[PDB]
Amino acid sequence: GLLKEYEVVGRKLPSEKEPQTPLYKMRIFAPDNIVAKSRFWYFLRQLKKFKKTTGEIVSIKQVYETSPVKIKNFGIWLRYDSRSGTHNMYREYRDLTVGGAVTQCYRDMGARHRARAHSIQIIKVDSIPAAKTRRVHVKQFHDSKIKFPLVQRVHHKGNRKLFSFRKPRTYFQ
Amino acid sequence: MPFERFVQTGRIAKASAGPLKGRLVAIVDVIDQNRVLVDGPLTGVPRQEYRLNNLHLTKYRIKFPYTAPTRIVRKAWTESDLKAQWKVSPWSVKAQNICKRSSLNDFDRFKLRYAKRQRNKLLTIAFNTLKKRTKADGTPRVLKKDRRERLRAEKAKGG
Amino acid sequence: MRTINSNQCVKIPKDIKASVKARVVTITGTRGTLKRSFKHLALDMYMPDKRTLKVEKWFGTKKELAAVRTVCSHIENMIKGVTFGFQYKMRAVYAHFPINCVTSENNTVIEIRNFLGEKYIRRVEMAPGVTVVNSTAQKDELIVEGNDIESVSGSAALIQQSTTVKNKDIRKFLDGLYVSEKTTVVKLES
Amino acid sequence: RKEHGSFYVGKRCVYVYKAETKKCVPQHPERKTRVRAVWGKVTRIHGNTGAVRARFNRNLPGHAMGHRIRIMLYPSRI
Amino acid sequence: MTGLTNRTVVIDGRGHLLGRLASVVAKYLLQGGKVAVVRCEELNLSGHFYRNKIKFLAYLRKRCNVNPARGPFHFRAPSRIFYKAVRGMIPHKTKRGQAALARLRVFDGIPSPYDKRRRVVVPIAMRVLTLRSDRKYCQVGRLSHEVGWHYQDVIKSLERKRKAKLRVTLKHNRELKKLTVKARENIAKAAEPFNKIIKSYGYEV
RNA sequence: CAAAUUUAUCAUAAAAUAUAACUUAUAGUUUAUGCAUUUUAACACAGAAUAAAUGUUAUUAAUUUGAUAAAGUGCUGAUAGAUUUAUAUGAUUACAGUGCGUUAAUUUUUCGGAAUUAUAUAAUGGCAUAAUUAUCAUUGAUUUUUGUGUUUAUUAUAUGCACUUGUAUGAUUAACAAUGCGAAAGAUUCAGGAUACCUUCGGGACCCGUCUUGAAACACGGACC
RNA sequence: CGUAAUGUUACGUGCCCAAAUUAACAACUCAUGCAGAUACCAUGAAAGGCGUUGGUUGCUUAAAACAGCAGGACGGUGAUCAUGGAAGUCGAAAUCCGCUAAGGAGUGUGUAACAACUCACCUGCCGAAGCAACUAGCCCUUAAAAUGGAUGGCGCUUAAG
RNA sequence: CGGCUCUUCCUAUCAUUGUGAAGCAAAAUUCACCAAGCGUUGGAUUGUUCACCCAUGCAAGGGAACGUGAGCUGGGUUUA
RNA sequence: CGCCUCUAAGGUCGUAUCCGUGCUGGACUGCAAUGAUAAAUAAGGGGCAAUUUGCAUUGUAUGGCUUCUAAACCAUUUAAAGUUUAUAAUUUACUUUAUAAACGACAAUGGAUGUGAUGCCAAUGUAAUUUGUAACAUAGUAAAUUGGGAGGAUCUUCGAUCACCUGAUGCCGCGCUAGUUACAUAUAAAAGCAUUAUUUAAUACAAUGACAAAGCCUAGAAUCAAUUGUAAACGACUUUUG
């Protein structure tokens, strides 16, 4: 889907020998909240003990990008499983939302490295400014004043007329 | 230059195929090579991204900073006199004739088949006996030069 | 990664009249004129009414923006090839048998014979617009000269690929006509 | 498109064609019953491109494929 | 005079990829079509020339051993290359698709009324919309000259006759409507049925 | 439900760029290639002023943009179907609606009109406590059985008699209208019919018996009656 | 899995063929004799590619490098190793010396042995990124059978992979 | 089973065409590339099939339908 | 990738291969050019018919009448190409060049630009019987006949190929538009107020058809049998027959 972010919090439900277990939290990227509560458990089983059934899910809440029309570069610290292959990457994308950059990373890994998405762990996701990005296909856009003439449109198929009388003509003037 | 569609600020482009189809956005920043950040304050467009497929670029370029908020963009449409310029622009006229031709009530349809028929009768009459191969001569002079005598003489009839 | 813009601007001198139209660069100088159609190439080519000629590319891959300096040196060959011209000079080296090279008026061709004591008379036609001659004041030498560098240099190497020596050791039978100095006609020397 | 093929949804269709012989008279207009017809309704649409689905009284013989069916403008909505 | 929408659609084959036109035609002909494709020497194939030449020469190698006269006949004209593509996208062993193939005329180089008729394009088959700048392409007229079709330069001379007949029928029809533009100032005082009523379409018409 | 970005809003704000003063620079150029004029899509995120310049600081209204949820929410346009021999051996059952109905105020368009308020009983909420029971956390909050008034809201019961083309017809399908008369012997109208075919077309479609894990089998048998 | 009518469903939607050449996108890939095209499944590896795409580590760098046009590279000496033979050099126990802005007892087909020469050093102009090593996407390569031939067929290349 | 006859196909290339490379001077050869168009024989011994022998030959490659018995032959094998 | 480099575009040399030519067959039976065109002369065949008729049916045309687009985008080039017009220079040719504007793949254009500027209509009757009768400013248009040149042929809907067309000869000298404004005249109501019904055709335009229907023109071949022997199993084949 489109992969919005959440904060899933978990406990280890306190048998009376232990009062008030220490409450870890996350930043999970997921299509929906039913799948964010098995990405919490997948990532925490690497880190602390307490699986489910022996833990609780305290509040999972969605976080709503704090500037949806400001324009910023997102660096994603990733690690994935290739065919021979656990690696780390640091990818950079350019977007407005932070769930929209993570989802622009889950396609790119599928395109470029064949990476079906169960292999990708996300470490960190930031909003790095500029003159901290490196990633030359993102530094293309870090200059006012940028021009680029367009060549891009739609060319309906068949059309509102399949057998046209007047030739689309990719160019004019 | 040949100068194709410049993606700038603030090159006014009219949207073309999306949910904003028909409205005139400005362009304030370029997200990536495929998407810009469109914002038309005087035309019912809040600031939002847009895919550059569904945009068609006009010839107007207003001036604001590349990181401006919507009030600076709205201030610059007015100073350019862009609304008065756009509706008299060479083929925004052409937009509204297709909008006029669009879907065209049944009385207006069959009124034009009547009104084009009558000037078409007036236009096949103003047609096609030029200098070519008359004068001289056109024999017999009485009858195959009967009708054009009223173009020539004009009075009255050969005669 | 589909670079946005790659461009190169060719300075054109005071006399010759370059005029790119629809991509086809024609150019016209003292020693004649030359048109080359670059329309295999999907590139900008416009002359911004200065002396200069600009060539641009929008969103080309990594290969596609190698052809910017290619075409901006094909035009820079043309501003020589109509002003200074080209003149190659291949020098006809032999061991025992002399090399006989006959051209006449105006007989653009060549007949190149006695190689290597062989009866067969190699005859090869120069391209349109290029004249071959025997070099006066330095004999046993040819002078291939014309306007277009791809029709001069294809006309030298047509007669360098024949004469060629077969079934022998080609490190020992160093015989043939090999290009000494690829040069321009009028500036400075020849 | 879908919006275009749904105008015709509800309306009455006909496959009209020719035979020769009656087993009838000029009771009504003056016929050898020398033109047949098989009526039907458009029931719904088919793809995303304005095709449609029809349900005739008899069944449409199949050598009718390619031939003209007529979308009567009634049962008339707006 | 007639056709199931108009007389026949005459598609100019100039600038159109062969298989993206052969499928919209084969679909249209199974719906009741009547098309004609003219200039079949000008259709395109994607990829460079030798890549397609290879594909055709391998097609020429298929032939029945116990009789080559039974075998796959390898028609070499650019129109009967296009008919080969359309015949594969038709069921041609049913009567439905064999009648669908009978509504198909294909021509190397535009004769006999389809030269004064009306040429429509199919903008989804058109090469300049689909392929890329720096992909390579060929024509079927070059492919057919290199494989055994003898009339490449018959139909180049035949066509510039036809393209010089059109040089004067565009010289007449450009001066013959210097008078229709003349006549539309002598009927300016019509009554007023142009002056207002065709401000329904109405700034240009 | 966060979002104080959207929007406008204050505060010293200091920036990650546009607007008014301009040196050079290629310039088909001007005159004597400087300038003159362009190019700014060489213009120095250079000089002066101004432009939230990023959020920093502020609070918010189109309830606070979207998403999720709920309310016969409501409306519109369709499609297909409609057992039913209400006794060839058990009520057309009950519900509900419409027609004459003491009044008196208060309004309403002003028409046979229409609305409201006024009657007891029984509840139920909202509110104000006083109990009580029992629990996340306990400054309090939630909760069970109550009580009584304070109260302000909402439902229910109090519609009998006669009549009628208003639901379940106790798997409801029932109406208006068009066409067509089952002629004394015999026409016609409408619908239907692989009767054994023939015509036409699209889909399907291997040859049966058999033994076999597996048969259309290049397994065996079978030319036909 | 009774016999029917209607509606809704994993495999698919360029044409065969019902349904997208999707007013839905981001990439990847050019395959000259099978580019590639859906599980099982109708084979293909090891090892490579300054083919292109992404990524990881380390150096040089806005002390002016990288590249290139412009300099030297001989020698304190055939120390020895050594006679195809080592005079700047097969091998090589061994190993210590020029000069400054700046020159190698120096790797070599074998230049019989010598010479030179030039990929270091460093003065340049250049004045901006350069250098390698490594990784795994696709394509290529590796990749050879006999009737004519099979992504099912056509045909596809800002795809119809 | 072989041989005889006759046709087609493969390339894992012997030769020839066009080439690249050698420790390629010429001659002769070797290695490799594109490449299946034409060619790849006569005998002695054995039923053979490979290998060997005489010889010619510029040069004497390897295989496919277990190719081929209502095509033959019947030597091998294999009934009495 | 400042140099270098056969490669990335783009050029090139080039095999006993490949594909053609030449050669051999020919969709059985494909196609094109061409020749003659009957049993005649009493009488009837055969065209030329489209004019020839009533007649009857056909197709389009469905209650005028739910149409044409046989007028158009150029040839080759092309994803910064690719476009127009204008003007001053120029063509064998919107020849090529120089300035200046215009939408610099808008909505546009995907249909109508109706691309010789379309029609379900002129007729002021627009349709299952219908037709139309005068004045004031515009407008000047389609019209039938016999002896010369320039032009038109891509596996065909009529080739003693021929449609703008030299100067000649005479007419119906007929029918005519558009507009304001006036008048006569005539047809039209299908019976149903859930007017949908056989869902059609008197309409017009093109086409055959048979029974009595007017003329113009026409006057053959093939095969068998016999023969040959350039051929041959038999057919077939090459031949010959006042």
mmCIF file of N, CA and C (backbone and C1' of nucleotides) in Angstrom, chain I residues 74-107:
data_model
loop_
_atom_site.group_PDB
_atom_site.id
_atom_site.type_symbol
_atom_site.label_atom_id
_atom_site.label_comp_id
_atom_site.label_asym_id
_atom_site.label_seq_id
_atom_site.Cartn_x
_atom_site.Cartn_y
_atom_site.Cartn_z
ATOM 1 P P C I 74 -1.166 13.921 -46.978
ATOM 2 O "O5'" C I 74 -0.081 14.546 -47.967
ATOM 3 C "C5'" C I 74 0.518 15.818 -47.741
ATOM 4 C "C4'" C I 74 1.933 15.891 -48.288
ATOM 5 C "C3'" C I 74 2.836 14.723 -47.917
ATOM 6 O "O3'" C I 74 2.680 13.614 -48.774
ATOM 7 C "C1'" C I 74 3.972 16.759 -47.489
ATOM 8 P P A I 75 2.119 12.264 -48.149
ATOM 9 O "O5'" A I 75 3.335 11.265 -48.267
ATOM 10 C "C5'" A I 75 4.579 11.554 -47.650
ATOM 11 C "C4'" A I 75 5.708 11.418 -48.631
ATOM 12 C "C3'" A I 75 7.064 11.125 -48.048
ATOM 13 O "O3'" A I 75 7.194 9.780 -47.646
ATOM 14 C "C1'" A I 75 7.263 12.754 -49.726
ATOM 15 P P U I 76 7.066 9.391 -46.092
ATOM 16 O "O5'" U I 76 8.568 9.059 -45.647
ATOM 17 C "C5'" U I 76 9.438 8.318 -46.492
ATOM 18 C "C4'" U I 76 10.791 8.967 -46.601
ATOM 19 C "C3'" U I 76 11.490 9.292 -45.297
ATOM 20 O "O3'" U I 76 12.055 8.164 -44.644
ATOM 21 C "C1'" U I 76 11.695 11.130 -46.765
ATOM 22 P P U I 77 11.386 7.572 -43.299
ATOM 23 O "O5'" U I 77 10.995 8.853 -42.428
ATOM 24 C "C5'" U I 77 11.873 9.355 -41.432
ATOM 25 C "C4'" U I 77 12.956 10.174 -42.075
ATOM 26 C "C3'" U I 77 14.066 10.723 -41.202
ATOM 27 O "O3'" U I 77 15.071 9.770 -40.899
ATOM 28 C "C1'" U I 77 13.293 12.394 -42.692
ATOM 29 P P U I 78 15.883 9.856 -39.515
ATOM 30 O "O5'" U I 78 15.080 10.939 -38.683
ATOM 31 C "C5'" U I 78 14.305 10.546 -37.568
ATOM 32 C "C4'" U I 78 14.053 11.702 -36.652
ATOM 33 C "C3'" U I 78 13.750 11.351 -35.208
ATOM 34 O "O3'" U I 78 14.870 10.964 -34.431
ATOM 35 C "C1'" U I 78 12.223 12.979 -35.953
ATOM 36 P P A I 79 14.642 10.085 -33.101
ATOM 37 O "O5'" A I 79 14.424 11.164 -31.939
ATOM 38 C "C5'" A I 79 13.703 10.843 -30.745
ATOM 39 C "C4'" A I 79 12.925 12.030 -30.230
ATOM 40 C "C3'" A I 79 13.390 12.661 -28.907
ATOM 41 O "O3'" A I 79 13.190 14.081 -28.964
ATOM 42 C "C1'" A I 79 11.142 12.132 -28.746
ATOM 43 P P A I 80 14.328 15.015 -29.598
ATOM 44 O "O5'" A I 80 13.803 16.495 -29.504
ATOM 45 C "C5'" A I 80 14.687 17.512 -29.910
ATOM 46 C "C4'" A I 80 14.239 18.843 -29.446
ATOM 47 C "C3'" A I 80 15.369 19.863 -29.428
ATOM 48 O "O3'" A I 80 15.154 20.933 -30.354
ATOM 49 C "C1'" A I 80 14.758 19.210 -27.219
ATOM 50 P P A I 81 15.592 20.866 -31.909
ATOM 51 O "O5'" A I 81 14.234 20.569 -32.673
ATOM 52 C "C5'" A I 81 14.215 20.278 -34.053
ATOM 53 C "C4'" A I 81 14.248 18.795 -34.236
ATOM 54 C "C3'" A I 81 13.173 18.185 -35.118
ATOM 55 O "O3'" A I 81 13.503 18.308 -36.498
ATOM 56 C "C1'" A I 81 13.336 16.981 -33.100
ATOM 57 P P G I 82 13.049 17.340 -37.712
ATOM 58 O "O5'" G I 82 11.487 17.556 -37.820
ATOM 59 C "C5'" G I 82 10.603 16.629 -37.237
ATOM 60 C "C4'" G I 82 9.528 17.336 -36.469
ATOM 61 C "C3'" G I 82 9.120 18.660 -37.024
ATOM 62 O "O3'" G I 82 8.598 18.746 -38.319
ATOM 63 C "C1'" G I 82 9.165 18.855 -34.714
ATOM 64 P P U I 83 8.981 20.095 -39.091
ATOM 65 O "O5'" U I 83 7.919 21.144 -38.558
ATOM 66 C "C5'" U I 83 6.545 20.848 -38.657
ATOM 67 C "C4'" U I 83 5.689 21.794 -37.871
ATOM 68 C "C3'" U I 83 5.215 23.013 -38.604
ATOM 69 O "O3'" U I 83 4.184 22.708 -39.513
ATOM 70 C "C1'" U I 83 5.763 23.560 -36.379
ATOM 71 P P U I 84 4.452 22.761 -41.088
ATOM 72 O "O5'" U I 84 3.542 23.972 -41.559
ATOM 73 C "C5'" U I 84 3.984 25.304 -41.378
ATOM 74 C "C4'" U I 84 3.008 26.139 -40.592
ATOM 75 C "C3'" U I 84 2.912 27.584 -41.041
ATOM 76 O "O3'" U I 84 2.015 27.759 -42.112
ATOM 77 C "C1'" U I 84 3.283 27.533 -38.730
ATOM 78 P P U I 85 2.577 27.990 -43.591
ATOM 79 O "O5'" U I 85 2.198 29.506 -43.876
ATOM 80 C "C5'" U I 85 0.907 29.980 -43.547
ATOM 81 C "C4'" U I 85 0.951 31.214 -42.687
ATOM 82 C "C3'" U I 85 1.644 32.422 -43.270
ATOM 83 O "O3'" U I 85 0.878 33.087 -44.252
ATOM 84 C "C1'" U I 85 2.254 32.180 -41.010
ATOM 85 P P A I 86 1.612 33.742 -45.514
ATOM 86 O "O5'" A I 86 2.356 35.002 -44.906
ATOM 87 C "C5'" A I 86 1.606 36.095 -44.412
ATOM 88 C "C4'" A I 86 2.471 37.046 -43.637
ATOM 89 C "C3'" A I 86 3.631 37.650 -44.401
ATOM 90 O "O3'" A I 86 3.245 38.747 -45.205
ATOM 91 C "C1'" A I 86 4.406 36.837 -42.347
ATOM 92 P P U I 87 3.612 38.765 -46.764
ATOM 93 O "O5'" U I 87 5.002 39.535 -46.812
ATOM 94 C "C5'" U I 87 5.138 40.812 -46.210
ATOM 95 C "C4'" U I 87 6.535 41.025 -45.692
ATOM 96 C "C3'" U I 87 7.643 40.891 -46.723
ATOM 97 O "O3'" U I 87 7.827 42.057 -47.503
ATOM 98 C "C1'" U I 87 8.197 39.621 -44.815
ATOM 99 P P A I 88 8.123 41.924 -49.075
ATOM 100 O "O5'" A I 88 9.707 42.017 -49.173
ATOM 101 C "C5'" A I 88 10.409 43.102 -48.585
ATOM 102 C "C4'" A I 88 11.808 42.702 -48.196
ATOM 103 C "C3'" A I 88 12.671 42.134 -49.310
ATOM 104 O "O3'" A I 88 13.245 43.117 -50.149
ATOM 105 C "C1'" A I 88 12.814 40.724 -47.437
ATOM 106 P P A I 89 13.558 42.758 -51.682
ATOM 107 O "O5'" A I 89 14.915 41.930 -51.615
ATOM 108 C "C5'" A I 89 15.057 40.689 -52.295
ATOM 109 C "C4'" A I 89 16.058 39.802 -51.596
ATOM 110 C "C3'" A I 89 16.638 38.652 -52.398
ATOM 111 O "O3'" A I 89 17.655 39.033 -53.305
ATOM 112 C "C1'" A I 89 15.969 37.846 -50.312
ATOM 113 P P U I 90 18.254 37.954 -54.334
ATOM 114 O "O5'" U I 90 17.130 36.823 -54.431
ATOM 115 C "C5'" U I 90 17.197 35.807 -55.420
ATOM 116 C "C4'" U I 90 17.009 34.428 -54.836
ATOM 117 C "C3'" U I 90 16.672 33.342 -55.849
ATOM 118 O "O3'" U I 90 17.806 32.814 -56.512
ATOM 119 C "C1'" U I 90 15.137 33.227 -54.070
ATOM 120 P P U I 91 17.692 32.336 -58.042
ATOM 121 O "O5'" U I 91 16.155 31.952 -58.217
ATOM 122 C "C5'" U I 91 15.759 30.869 -59.043
ATOM 123 C "C4'" U I 91 15.542 29.611 -58.237
ATOM 124 C "C3'" U I 91 15.055 28.402 -59.012
ATOM 125 O "O3'" U I 91 16.086 27.753 -59.727
ATOM 126 C "C1'" U I 91 13.795 28.616 -57.029
ATOM 127 P P U I 92 16.000 27.678 -61.324
ATOM 128 O "O5'" U I 92 14.477 27.305 -61.589
ATOM 129 C "C5'" U I 92 14.026 26.969 -62.889
ATOM 130 C "C4'" U I 92 13.356 25.618 -62.911
ATOM 131 C "C3'" U I 92 12.455 25.299 -61.732
ATOM 132 O "O3'" U I 92 11.177 25.887 -61.856
ATOM 133 C "C1'" U I 92 13.817 23.423 -62.255
ATOM 134 P P A I 93 10.488 26.577 -60.585
ATOM 135 O "O5'" A I 93 10.190 25.359 -59.610
ATOM 136 C "C5'" A I 93 8.859 24.961 -59.329
ATOM 137 C "C4'" A I 93 8.798 24.196 -58.037
ATOM 138 C "C3'" A I 93 9.081 24.997 -56.778
ATOM 139 O "O3'" A I 93 7.939 25.723 -56.346
ATOM 140 C "C1'" A I 93 10.330 22.990 -56.743
ATOM 141 P P C I 94 7.960 26.635 -55.021
ATOM 142 O "O5'" C I 94 7.346 25.680 -53.906
ATOM 143 C "C5'" C I 94 6.132 26.011 -53.248
ATOM 144 C "C4'" C I 94 6.401 26.587 -51.882
ATOM 145 C "C3'" C I 94 7.384 25.805 -51.028
ATOM 146 O "O3'" C I 94 8.745 25.999 -51.361
ATOM 147 C "C1'" C I 94 5.487 26.317 -49.735
ATOM 148 P P U I 95 9.751 24.765 -51.180
ATOM 149 O "O5'" U I 95 10.975 25.079 -52.140
ATOM 150 C "C5'" U I 95 11.799 24.025 -52.605
ATOM 151 C "C4'" U I 95 13.167 24.523 -52.974
ATOM 152 C "C3'" U I 95 13.967 25.168 -51.859
ATOM 153 O "O3'" U I 95 14.593 24.242 -50.989
ATOM 154 C "C1'" U I 95 14.047 26.548 -53.754
ATOM 155 P P U I 96 14.126 24.148 -49.453
ATOM 156 O "O5'" U I 96 15.343 24.737 -48.618
ATOM 157 C "C5'" U I 96 16.685 24.404 -48.928
ATOM 158 C "C4'" U I 96 17.526 25.647 -49.030
ATOM 159 C "C3'" U I 96 17.491 26.575 -47.828
ATOM 160 O "O3'" U I 96 18.324 26.176 -46.758
ATOM 161 C "C1'" U I 96 17.175 27.832 -49.794
ATOM 162 P P U I 97 17.938 26.592 -45.258
ATOM 163 O "O5'" U I 97 18.314 28.132 -45.174
ATOM 164 C "C5'" U I 97 19.670 28.531 -45.139
ATOM 165 C "C4'" U I 97 19.830 30.002 -45.408
ATOM 166 C "C3'" U I 97 19.355 30.944 -44.322
ATOM 167 O "O3'" U I 97 20.275 31.067 -43.250
ATOM 168 C "C1'" U I 97 18.644 31.732 -46.437
ATOM 169 P P A I 98 19.771 31.527 -41.794
ATOM 170 O "O5'" A I 98 19.421 33.066 -41.963
ATOM 171 C "C5'" A I 98 20.455 34.018 -42.161
ATOM 172 C "C4'" A I 98 19.912 35.420 -42.129
ATOM 173 C "C3'" A I 98 19.021 35.726 -40.940
ATOM 174 O "O3'" A I 98 19.787 36.137 -39.826
ATOM 175 C "C1'" A I 98 17.955 36.413 -42.940
ATOM 176 P P U I 99 19.134 36.174 -38.370
ATOM 177 O "O5'" U I 99 18.606 37.667 -38.252
ATOM 178 C "C5'" U I 99 17.680 38.025 -37.247
ATOM 179 C "C4'" U I 99 16.739 39.093 -37.729
ATOM 180 C "C3'" U I 99 15.432 39.195 -36.971
ATOM 181 O "O3'" U I 99 15.547 39.939 -35.774
ATOM 182 C "C1'" U I 99 15.001 39.200 -39.292
ATOM 183 P P A I 100 14.954 39.341 -34.410
ATOM 184 O "O5'" A I 100 13.384 39.549 -34.549
ATOM 185 C "C5'" A I 100 12.841 40.820 -34.862
ATOM 186 C "C4'" A I 100 11.368 40.723 -35.160
ATOM 187 C "C3'" A I 100 10.573 39.808 -34.259
ATOM 188 O "O3'" A I 100 10.323 40.361 -32.987
ATOM 189 C "C1'" A I 100 9.913 39.470 -36.492
ATOM 190 P P A I 101 9.773 39.419 -31.817
ATOM 191 O "O5'" A I 101 8.208 39.654 -31.878
ATOM 192 C "C5'" A I 101 7.325 38.699 -31.333
ATOM 193 C "C4'" A I 101 6.136 38.488 -32.223
ATOM 194 C "C3'" A I 101 5.337 37.237 -31.940
ATOM 195 O "O3'" A I 101 4.490 37.351 -30.819
ATOM 196 C "C1'" A I 101 5.760 37.339 -34.227
ATOM 197 P P A I 102 4.659 36.308 -29.616
ATOM 198 O "O5'" A I 102 3.610 35.170 -29.964
ATOM 199 C "C5'" A I 102 2.276 35.506 -30.293
ATOM 200 C "C4'" A I 102 1.689 34.497 -31.226
ATOM 201 C "C3'" A I 102 1.695 33.069 -30.723
ATOM 202 O "O3'" A I 102 0.649 32.779 -29.819
ATOM 203 C "C1'" A I 102 2.559 33.109 -32.888
ATOM 204 P P C I 103 0.986 32.318 -28.322
ATOM 205 O "O5'" C I 103 -0.102 31.193 -28.045
ATOM 206 C "C5'" C I 103 -0.163 30.520 -26.798
ATOM 207 C "C4'" C I 103 -0.460 29.054 -26.960
ATOM 208 C "C3'" C I 103 0.699 28.126 -26.702
ATOM 209 O "O3'" C I 103 1.099 27.970 -25.348
ATOM 210 C "C1'" C I 103 -0.340 27.480 -28.687
ATOM 211 P P G I 104 2.658 28.187 -24.973
ATOM 212 O "O5'" G I 104 3.467 27.548 -26.188
ATOM 213 C "C5'" G I 104 3.753 26.155 -26.228
ATOM 214 C "C4'" G I 104 4.879 25.823 -27.180
ATOM 215 C "C3'" G I 104 5.927 24.883 -26.604
ATOM 216 O "O3'" G I 104 5.623 23.546 -26.910
ATOM 217 C "C1'" G I 104 6.962 26.790 -27.605
ATOM 218 P P A I 105 5.967 22.392 -25.881
ATOM 219 O "O5'" A I 105 5.393 21.079 -26.542
ATOM 220 C "C5'" A I 105 4.809 20.077 -25.735
ATOM 221 C "C4'" A I 105 3.718 19.384 -26.493
ATOM 222 C "C3'" A I 105 2.418 19.210 -25.789
ATOM 223 O "O3'" A I 105 1.730 20.411 -25.658
ATOM 224 C "C1'" A I 105 2.872 17.317 -27.049
ATOM 225 P P C I 106 0.523 20.516 -24.620
ATOM 226 O "O5'" C I 106 -0.741 20.129 -25.526
ATOM 227 C "C5'" C I 106 -1.826 21.001 -25.772
ATOM 228 C "C4'" C I 106 -2.321 21.466 -24.458
ATOM 229 C "C3'" C I 106 -3.814 21.631 -24.207
ATOM 230 O "O3'" C I 106 -4.241 20.650 -23.273
ATOM 231 C "C1'" C I 106 -2.456 23.286 -23.131
ATOM 232 P P A I 107 -4.996 19.312 -23.728
ATOM 233 O "O5'" A I 107 -6.364 19.340 -22.890
ATOM 234 C "C5'" A I 107 -6.498 20.107 -21.693
ATOM 235 C "C4'" A I 107 -7.715 21.013 -21.721
ATOM 236 C "C3'" A I 107 -8.524 20.970 -22.990
ATOM 237 O "O3'" A I 107 -9.425 19.880 -23.019
ATOM 238 C "C1'" A I 107 -8.254 23.218 -22.239
#
